[PDB]
């Protein structure tokens, strides 16, 4: 069973940073990727970026380059998203999702599947 | 008594000798769409 | 494509199957059997090291696609020219079975000395028309 | 301001076929695959349609995907109560070098459609003495529960200092919501009038206050 | 291009404007709208360092110019073929308004049973000629 489990809820002062964790289960992590999408309360979905579980290659949304970093750890099959310099606009739910693409340029020819809670 | 030989022509085609003419037409073209990669039919794919 | 009859007998209409059968698909198959070499990345390239070589690769690819495109466009243009210019032979087949019992109007029409009804016209469409029945000079 | 344009609301009586449109451009829907996600309140979105036309396993043939040029569409036939949710379209956008989402359409299938009541409060004298000013626009009795709110200073739009709540199911299964426009007394005094306009089912109900009147 | 009248009334001459109007310029525009990529020095080249790459550049340039030239020559050749072969339609337009009152000579000429003066010929040039005036069978 394809599982994604994230770290607990966080609360932060403006200007600090958050690291959110995403542990993977039930599929071959090293042949998939993770995207992150966030949702401001009562609003729409904003794509943040993707990272390969095969190579650690990343591609971030233009609005978040600079502020965001994604890393991943094959051993623990876990991905992390770091968001720096938090403002009030960063209040949101952070989803991770299994992304089918794991190498080549990330160009949206693939898609993301299952979303974490 | 007279005996003779015997339409709407919205489609246009290109021709080297007659220039651009009104005609129906059989299109020879397609603009494909971006999809994910796959296994090449006849062949190993690494 | 077909032939039409006029007169006080009404207006008769018939079709010719050989013309229709002859009528483009073969032409298309001919266009569709064109085959051309692949154009992939060259194997000793190396993006970091040899860019210049690589730029030239790009050049040769682009140039190929262009040329081959022009060639194709030509083949098509010619083909269409043929298809449209060919559209006058039925006239000659009709003239064949008359005799000089009718005059060439040039309108793609003839004036026959007798009258022709539907059953009479189907026999010309089938090519079985020879008139000694309406007795007039035979070819 | 979403790159893909989705109507905020779509509806139909149970059994009917409703459609949800999604309007983009050459860089996104025109050249790329469309994806559809369905979200029930307080849950993860779920993949409903993929590569414009496909159905994941579990997704009934009641759901159908369509695409033409730079616009895609989701069709839900045989409409049922459990299809009440939010539906999001997504495609890659080659111009912005990232995924893009539509604003999301709320699908409502059990009551007659009702227009919203709107009442607009100017700031109190009490609040202005504390050097603050808030315009209060209260929206009630509308169904289904989807409205958009716009504000006006005289006749020109204002986007700064606006806070609208998500709508809330109320005492009679109708819906209500609120919106606030925070101002300095300086601003409040400098305009002939202020407006709160509430769009609901392609129909706008407007209410106006003037600083000078009581 | 035009038509001529003979007889004891002298020799009449008239011109056809649609033929002239139809008559090459469009063809030329078609030839003139051809567009092709630029062929400049490649930017990582470096005359001193990489000559071999450079020699290959030269090669690709020359090859391009040649091919594209051949293509053009073809387009022109075809075009000229059309222009010259097309030069016989006026004949068919004249045959249209007669009736079988004249015989096809094949010389591009006909023999009419009546006489035709200048005013009579301008009316055929204008296409307004239909003779019940000289009363003979009408098409």
């Amino acid at each position: 069973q394809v599982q994604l489990v994230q770290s607990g809820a966080e609360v932060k002062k403006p200007g600090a940073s958050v690291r959110v964790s995403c542990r993977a289960s039930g599929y071959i992590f090293t042949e998939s990727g993770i995207t992150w999408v966030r949702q401001a309360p009562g609003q729409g979905l904003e794509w943040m970026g993707w990272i390969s579980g095969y190579s650690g290659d990343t591609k971030y949304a233009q609005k978040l380059q600079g502020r965001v970093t994604m890393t991943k750890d094959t051993s623990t099959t876990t991905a992390y998203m770091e968001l720096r310099s938090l403002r009030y606009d960063d209040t949101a739910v952070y989803y991770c999702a299994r992304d089918v693409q794991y190498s080549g340029s990330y160009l949206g020819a693939y898609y993301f599947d299952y979303w974490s809670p | 008594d007279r005996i003779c030989t015997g339409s709407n022509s919205p489609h246009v085609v290109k021709t080297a000798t007659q220039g651009e003419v009104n005609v129906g037409v059989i299109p020879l073209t397609t603009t494909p769409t971006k999809s994910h990669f796959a296994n090449l039919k006849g062949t190993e794919t690494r | 494509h077909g032939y039409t009859s006029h007169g006080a007998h009404g207006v008769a209409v018939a079709a010719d199957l050989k013309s229709t059968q002859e009528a483009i698909t073969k032409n298309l198959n001919s266009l569709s059997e064109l085959e051309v070499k692949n154009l992939q990345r060259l194997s000793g390239a190396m993006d970091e090291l040899h860019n210049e070589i690589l730029e030239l690769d790009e050049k040769v690819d682009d140039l190929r696609a262009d040329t081959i495109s022009s060639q194709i466009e030509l083949a098509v243009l010619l083909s269409n020219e043929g298809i449209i210019n060919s559209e006058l032979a039925l006239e000659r087949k009709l003239k064949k079975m008359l005799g000089p019992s009718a005059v060439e109007i040039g309108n793609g029409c003839f004036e026959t000395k007798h009258k022709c009804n539907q059953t009479c016209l189907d026999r010309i469409a089938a090519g079985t028309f020879d008139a000694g029945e309406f007795s007039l000079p035979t070819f | 301001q979403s790159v893909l344009t989705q109507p905020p609301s779509a509806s139909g009586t149970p059994g009917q076929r409703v459609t949800i449109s999604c309007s983009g451009s050459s860089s996104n829907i025109g050249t790329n695959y469309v994806y559809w996600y369905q979200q029930f309140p307080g849950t993860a979105p779920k993949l409903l349609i993929y590569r414009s036309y496909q159905r994941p396993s579990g997704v009934p043939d009641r759901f159908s995907g369509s695409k033409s040029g730079s616009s895609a569409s989701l069709a839900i036939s045989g409409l049922q109560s459990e299809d009440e949710a939010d539906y999001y379209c997504a495609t890659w956008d080659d111009s912005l070098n990232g995924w893009v989402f539509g604003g999301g359409t709320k699908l409502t299938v059990r009551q007659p459609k009702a227009a919203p009541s709107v009442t607009l409060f100017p700031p109190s004298s009490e609040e202005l003495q504390a050097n603050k000013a808030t315009l209060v626009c209260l929206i009630s009795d509308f169904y289904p529960g989807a409205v958009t709110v716009a504000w006006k200073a005289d006749s020109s739009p204002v986007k700064a200092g606006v806070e609208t709540t998500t709508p809330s199911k109320q005492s009679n299964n109708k819906y209500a919501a609120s919106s606030y426009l925070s101002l300095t007394p300086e601003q409040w005094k400098s305009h002939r009038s202020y407006s709160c306009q509430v769009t609901h089912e392609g129909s706008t109900v407007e209410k106006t206050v003037a600083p000078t009147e009581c």
Side-chain angles (χ1 to χ4, degrees), chain B residues 33-36, chain D residues 32-33 51 94:
Chain B
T33 59
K34 293 179 179 179
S35 170
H36 63 53
Chain D
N32 297 289
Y33 275 122
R51 301 170 54 80
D94 291 282

Side-chain angles (χ1 to χ4, degrees), chain A residues 1-17:
Chain A
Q1 60 287 357
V2 169
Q3 294 233 30
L4 296 173
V5 175
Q6 289 183 276
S7 68
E10 301 269 11
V11 60
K12 294 291 206 296
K13 290 89 179 172
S17 45

Side-chain angles (χ1 to χ4, degrees), chain D residues 4 13 31 34 38 44 68-69 92 96 108 113 122 133 136 157 182 190 202 209:
Chain D
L4 310 181
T13 53
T31 64
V34 178
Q38 175 192 71
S68 179
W92 174 264
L96 301 172
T108 301
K113 274 167 179 139
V136 189
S182 303
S190 72
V209 295

